[PDB]
């Protein structure tokens, strides 16, 4: 915005989609998906 | 060029123009000549009687 160094204005942007607003399994009628999770070593140890 | 709206291709074009003009500065400095003396290519001094 100016003629010298560091003289700027910042515009922030946001990632907007289903994921960042929730609503993933809106499921009004009760049929949908969850895409549950990915396992880890802690999960394996807990499972035994 | 310093604005963040420009993309990579735009920055490349602007830097191409910048490089061309820097080359012009160097060329003018090298080729400017008076009576066989490169005035802008030396850091010396001239004496006039």
UniProtKB/TrEMBL annotation, chain B:
Cell location: Secreted; Bacterial flagellum
Described function: Flagellin is the subunit protein which polymerizes to form the filaments of bacterial flagella.
Family: Belongs to the bacterial flagellin family.
Protein name: Flagellin
Residues of the full protein shown: 99 to 147 of 585
